[PDB]
Amino acid sequence: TEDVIKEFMQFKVRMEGSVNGHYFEIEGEGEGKPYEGTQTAKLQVTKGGPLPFAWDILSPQFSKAYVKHPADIPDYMKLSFPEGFTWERSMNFEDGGVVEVQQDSSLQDGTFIYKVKFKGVNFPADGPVMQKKTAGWEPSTEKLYPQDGVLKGEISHALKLKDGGHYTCDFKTVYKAKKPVQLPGNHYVDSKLDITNHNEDYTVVEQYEHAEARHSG
Amino acid sequence: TEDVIKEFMQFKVRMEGSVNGHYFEIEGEGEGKPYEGTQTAKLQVTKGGPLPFAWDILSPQFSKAYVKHPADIPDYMKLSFPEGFTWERSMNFEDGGVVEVQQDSSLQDGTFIYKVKFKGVNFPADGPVMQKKTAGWEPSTEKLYPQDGVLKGEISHALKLKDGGHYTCDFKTVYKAKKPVQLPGNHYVDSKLDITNHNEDYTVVEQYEHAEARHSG
């Protein structure tokens, strides 16, 4: 990968989507140290704004070539290049919210290109997401296992709620390489995603993640 | 220090302090994996509550024996035990709030004890601390270096504001071991302090830190 994924790598994204009908179009840029598990992202609502829901349901959809892997642990999403990989995710929240996401990752001109497609459905409108009472995602840990010749990962995740409580979402995600690649083992990735800046409308937002692969206790 | 510091270790803390003349007494507890850089803390306002200011100015005072070091970097804090270490900090906010902190660290019955004294003054009375408008410390990195047989450390920190605005602070900390210990080197350490849980009135709050040592770059 030394030759395809370099110590610093830049990326661009476009997301088409809808939460409960509301269509939005977002267009973003990022850049980061991939072998160190640290990335950044600048985003902008490019149609739909002000978005009538929480950025957080959208946050973990704006980069797993940038996960610090040990050398004992193999980096599926890095060795997936220059060809790429795709993930389709299901997020089940407690109030009944359901986000289903599909994404295509590409490498062209030394820049990662990411095309994301998002659909939110049946979100309680007396709930945090639509009432915008969420305050960042709590730190997280995901268990990554292989199955059916692809890599699968689950999270039992909670969103920080403004008052002081949580909001439980369950992530299942499948990753598949556009080419044939050796699958990692039963491993776990540890990560935190932060909104570091924004405007009052969340029509422009700044983000940062740190992710490291590991084993179990 | 593998006879004094264990893979999993627990701590207790008492903070007495003053903000703009107000007096508060906190008492708390934590645990964590000191060789993984991770740790959790549940505190409580035991006198002075509801606190008339932002918890964030208090977050970084309630953990450097909880920082993952490389082998090439020497852990001054882990080696300052069981006799322990002392530290004292200065925080200068843009608006002109000054916080000077002092703390004593000791290990008794293999439980860390912390005793914090904190004195906040000249906090502007229409500012993002006295109007509780802050929403998290931004991720940071500390320029740790030696001077006068002690360890000093600088941070150009920022606080997140509930409108997308950051709020600048300026950390200077001095670390002193109650014993003779080899001083480390010109190094940098990264961290992210998350308020994971909390009650409405911030009379009960839960915290999380991740902290890993490194060299420049």
Residue A89 CA neighbour count, 13 Å, CB half: 24
* CA distances for A183 relative to A78, A80, A81, B140, angstroms: 12, 10, 14, 34
Buried b (16+ CB within 10 A) or exposed e, A178-212: eeebeebeebbbbbbbbbbbbeeebbebebbbbbb
Check CB contact of A200 with chain B, cutoff 8 Å. yes
Residue B57 CA neighbour count, 13 Å, CB half: 33
Distance CA A212, CA B188 (A): 18
Find the CB nearest A139 among B164, B194, B199: B194
Distance CA B193, CA B59 (A): 7
Distance CA A121, CA A129 (A): 12
Backbone angles phi, psi at A149, to 5 degrees: 65, 35
C-beta of residue B136 within 8 angstroms of C-beta of residue B205: no
Backbone angles phi, psi at A198, to 5 degrees: 180, 180
Identify the bridge partners of residue B194 per DSSP, sorted by sequence position: B208
Percent of chain B that is helix, strand, coil (3-state, to 5): 5, 55, 40
Distance CA A1, CA A82 (A): 9
Closest CA to B196 of B30, B37, B41, B51: B41
Closest CA to A116 of A136, A100, A133, A95: A100
Method in brief: X-ray
Check CB contact under 8 Å for A197 and B166: yes
Per DSSP, the residues of A87-139 read EEEEEEESSS-EEEEEEEEEEETTEEEEEEEEEEE---TTSHHHHT-EEEEPP
Question: Domain spanning B1-217 has what CATH number?
Answer: 2.40.155.10
Buried b (16+ CB within 10 A) or exposed e, B56-89: bbbbbbbbbbbbbbeeebbbbbbbbbeebbbbeb
Distance CA B41, CA B31 (A): 7
Pairing assessment for the beta strands A9-19 and A111-121 based on DSSP bridges = parallel
Tokens representing residue A55 in the block: 């950025």
Tokens representing residue B217 in the block: 């770059």
Q: Which residue has the tokens 């906090």?
A: B123
Q: Roughly how many angstroms between the first and final C-alpha of chain B, as a whole number?
A: 28
Find the CB nearest A208 among B135, B139, B195: B139
Cα Dmax for chain B: 50
Per DSSP, the residues of B108-150 read ETTEEEEEEEEEEE---TTSTTTT--EEEEPPEEEEEEE-SSS
Header resolution in angstroms: 2.9
Tokens representing residue B98 in the block: 């000054």
Pairing assessment for the beta strands A9-19 and A22-33 based on DSSP bridges = antiparallel
* Residues 6 or more apart in contact with residue B117 via CB below 8 angstroms: B15, B16, B17, B101, B102, B103
Check CB contact of B7 with chain A, cutoff 8 Å. no
Q: Specify the 3-state DSSP secondary structure of A157.
A: strand
Distance CA B22, CA B12 (A): 24
Domain ranges (residues) in chain B? 1-217
Q: Roughly how many angstroms between the first and final C-alpha of chain A, as a whole number?
A: 29
DSSP class of A6: -
Check CB contact under 8 Å for A195 and B160: yes
Distance CA A34, CA A38 (A): 6
Find the CB nearest A139 among B135, B163, B208: B208
> Residue B203 CB: number of other CB atoms within 10 A?
17
Distance CA A113, CA A106 (A): 5
Closest CA to A43 of A201, A211, A212, A210: A201
Residue A39 Cα to chain centre, angstroms? 12
Check CB contact of B196 with chain A, cutoff 8 Å. yes
Closest CA to A78 of A88, A87, A67, A86: A67
Identify the closest residue of chain A to B160 by CA–CA distance. Answer: A196
Tokens representing residue B62 in the block: 């309630």
Pairing assessment for the beta strands B22-33 and B111-121 based on DSSP bridges = unpaired
Distance CA A65, CA A6 (A): 11
Name the strand (E) or helix (H) holding B78: helix B76-79
Identify the bridge partners of residue A12 per DSSP, sorted by sequence position: A29, A113
- Of the residues A138, A168, A188, A193, the best mutation for testing chain B's interface (the one with the most B CB atoms within 10 Å of its CB) is A138
C-beta of residue B51 within 8 angstroms of C-beta of residue B130: no
DSSP class of B68: B
Residue B14 CA neighbour count, 13 Å, CB half: 6
Tokens representing residue A122 in the block: 């049946």
Check CB contact under 8 Å for A210 and B139: yes
Backbone angles phi, psi at B102, to 5 degrees: -130, 150
Identify the closest residue of chain A to B211 by CA–CA distance. Answer: A210
Distance CA A3, CA A110 (A): 10
